[PDB]
Structure formats: structure tokens, C-alpha cells
Amino acid sequence: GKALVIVESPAKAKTINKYLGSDYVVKSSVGHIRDLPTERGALVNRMGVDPWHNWEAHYEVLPGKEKVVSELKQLAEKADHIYLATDLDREGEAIAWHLREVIGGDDARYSRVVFNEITKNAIRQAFNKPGELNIDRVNAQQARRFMDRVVGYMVSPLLWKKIARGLSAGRVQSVAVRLVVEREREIKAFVPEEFWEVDASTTTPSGEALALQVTHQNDKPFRPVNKEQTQAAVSLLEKARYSVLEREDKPTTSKPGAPFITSTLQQAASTRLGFGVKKTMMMAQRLYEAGYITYMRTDSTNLSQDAVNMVRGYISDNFGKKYLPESPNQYAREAIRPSDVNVMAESLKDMEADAQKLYQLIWRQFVACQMTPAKYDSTTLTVGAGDFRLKARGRILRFDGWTKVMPALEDRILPAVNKGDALTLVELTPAQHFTKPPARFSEASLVKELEKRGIGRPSTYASIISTIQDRGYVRVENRRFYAEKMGEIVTDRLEENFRELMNYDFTAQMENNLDQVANHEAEWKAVLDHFFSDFTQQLDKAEKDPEEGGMRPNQM
Questions:
Q1: Do 175 and 455 touch, CB atoms closer than 8 A?
Q2: Beta-carbon contacts of residue 98 (< 8 Å; ≥ 6 apart)
Q3: I need a labelling partner for 272 at 20 to 30 A (CA). Which of 73, 260, 314, 479 fits?
Q4: 324 shares its domain with 388
Q5: Within this chain, do residues 132 and 63 fall inside the same structural domain, yes or no?
Q6: Active site (annotated) includes residue 295
């Protein structure tokens, strides 16, 4: 009469089993057990969803899983209660729902447990206060699944006819491609402009070197556009008398960043470790299922009281009181953090070197976010030379604070000077510059852009960036995105005939609509109806000849 606990993977099963007694029987479902299949009637059969019959679905047990279903059913017959312990996101809720639907029995037989990490305490708490399956969240997940299916299965065939066979369309994927295509065109159309900078090397009364940058001339910003103007300025600067107009000394500080969320982990791992978003998320999942970090799909910077107490104790013992803020730093269901601050990257079991590196990144970010700010003594010198104004900036680290937990180190240290001091000109160095086009997207900046526009979600950031590449619309080279010709071809056609679908605001709004379903503020089938109404309006027109406003063929 034990209890049956179901999780999605053998890795999760092994970890969670360490924290569940003999009264519990833990079993993996070996992944998703049931899902959508992988003229109009044939279309509906392929999609597994019927937009014309109120979204009736035809789910099918995944290949090779009938055996898993049988195994779970037999285990269920011997259990007094069943605990669905899938991951906490909407996808996890839907997996739990599918499990309940295939196993059967009364709903009172099931409970849905939620935890942000697999630890003795988190599991104990999750099973002490078990919840119920949330159908609104399930409906939100399926609405997303159905919209995505409709776009992929109904737009793609149009692309095969009009542009080229094999092309794949995606609801959000196409919008992400649009971002890259626009950037490509901005760069192609950019016309650089020439401008010069002039630096002066001087010496203080004590003879110390002081480098200055010319900032103004006649009280206006200094920015010569050619050699002639630069040389004329250099001529005046060579003859000028230099003196310190003002010396400003003020204490400044640098605060540590918030603990990671999915988006920021992807950005940091890419920029700091050179890890692609796919690699980062795969390793993060392994760390999470092994019980080393909190759940890797989150947009919350919240930290539990226990987690904060844990890390503050670590800081106090290992760095000292000067590194401990009076009260915890609050940044805000939880950020991505170590499950146990006392577990070092070097101690991780069955984790590859790069996975240890990711853990270390997460660990240092978490520890640093609860440490005190770094303190600097900043100095800005303003120098006058005839009608010119020059500046020099520097700073001295006074207290490392949170930077102590980061790798050992560079900031400029200006010499001691007093307002009114004369400076001796040693050298002048003009430098030609050119304005630059918008920077290309990097994996880090693309994720950031998706987040900024409200198009990406923790569960989709990685998938979006990966798909747009495999589908041949964009490519990454030298760590930067480049739009492919086909990317531009498809994007133009989609913008022309599927304006609403391609619109950034509408796409962000759809994410909001799904959240509304999840929070019982909207009904899933009605949301799908509205989506489909607007969609079919775009599709019907697009299928027509170009002369009638239909999609332009890929020719000439």
C-alpha cells in the first residue's frame, strides 16, 4: 500500500529517491508518455488538433512507451496514492496531466508536488503539503502547443509551394529570425563617418605622467571630422598653457549582480565561459536533476529565507564581517542558485569539467549577490589649455567587497594634482576613428533582446535560438549572428502576408494571453479561436496569387 511517485527521468528518480522513505516507490516515466503525433481531414490527422471542431485533440502514446504505461498502471494498482512529481513549469504540469489521463482512476488518487530543487528539505516540504493538478496551467501549455502546431503545419506547406520545399515556419521562430534580418539590413545600409580624437601626454609639477583627452573647444564638444581640422587643433594645443581647472574626488561603489535567472545565466555563460545556450541549458538540467542547483527555468530573482541564511553564514565564515551587508539583499519562484552553498564545483560527482564550470559561475554569482559593494575612490581631472578643455578619469580600489569571490584581477590611477597646478605638455597624439554600425547579435545579446521584447520565455529561449539556426535562416560565425539569404526571403514574405504574426508587440501579447489562461483570466479555447481567426485571415489571403495580394513567389 505504498505511495507511487512519478518523475520524468531516471536521473531525477535516482536523486529524489534519496529523500523519500520506504513508503514511497519512485518510478521514471522515461520521458513524455503521451503527446501530439510526431485535404482538411488529413491536415487534422497530421496535426493531432482540430481547429474546426473546437480544438479536439488526438494524443498518442509515444513510440516504445506502451510498456511504460503498462508498468505504471500495475504499480498504480498497488499504490494507495499517486504523486506526480514532474518539473514545476507548465510543460511539467501537462506531463503530469498526461500521466494521470493514461494511468486512470479517480482524480482523488492523484496529487501534484512542486519543488524548486531536489534536496532533503525541499522534498520533505513538497510531500508534506502536496497540491492538486492545475488544469489552467495545463490548458495554457496546450494552447501554446496547439498554436505552435497550427503555425508550423499550416504555414510551412505554403512556404513549400511559394518559396522552396523543406522550409519550416514557427510562431516565435519566425519573429526571432526577423530580429536578425533587420539587424543585417541595418548593418548593410550603414554609412560610417570619420571623426578624430586628440590625446595629450603631460607631466605634473612633481614630474608624474598624466594622460588627457581633449573634450571641448570654445565650450563645445571637440570632434574634428578630417585631418585638416585635427591638425589646426593640434597646432593650437601645442602652444597652449595647461592648468588643472578642477579636481573632483568622490567615493563610488560597484554592486554585485542579481542571482541568475534563465536569461541571464545564458548570457553570462556565453560571454564569460564561451558556452552556447543549448550547452548551458543541457548542463544546467543535469546539475538540477542531480540535486546541485535550483530549477533552471525561471524568471524570478527571488531567494528563499533559508538560502539567504545559508549564504550569509558562508560569507561570514569564509570572508568576514566587512563582506556581509547589514541585511540581506533582496532582488525580487526562485533564482538559479546552488542547492547547498557548502558544495564546491570541485566536489561535484559525475559532472563533466564544463558542467563544473557552469556550477562555479552560478555559485560565485549567488555568493556575490549577498556580499557588500566594492568601494572606490574616483577622480576626475578637468584641465584647461587655451580655449580647450581636457579630461582624465581614474579610480583606486579601497575595498573589494563582492569582487573578492571573483577571480583575482587594472583601473587607471591618476597622479596627485591640485586645482590650479600647471601641467607641461610632452606629446600630442591625434587618432582617426570611424562611426560604427549597430553591433551584430551574439547569442548573449539575442537572448537579451528576446527577453527585452517579451517574446522569449524561460522554457523557450534556448529552443528559439537553436531552431532558427538549424532551419537555415541565420548562422553564427565568429560568435555573431548573420542572416542567411533564405532568412531574408522568408522574413520578407511573412512580413508582407502575415503582418500580425510577425509583429513584435502582438507576439509579446500572445505570451501575455497564455499567462492569462494559466491564471484563469482567459479561457484556452477562446484564446485559440481568436488566434485562429486572425491566423486564417492572414493564410487565406497569402495563398492567393500575388496579383490579388497573395504571397510573392521566390523567383526573379
A1: yes
A2: 32, 33, 34, 35, 59
A3: 314
A4: no
A5: yes
A6: yes
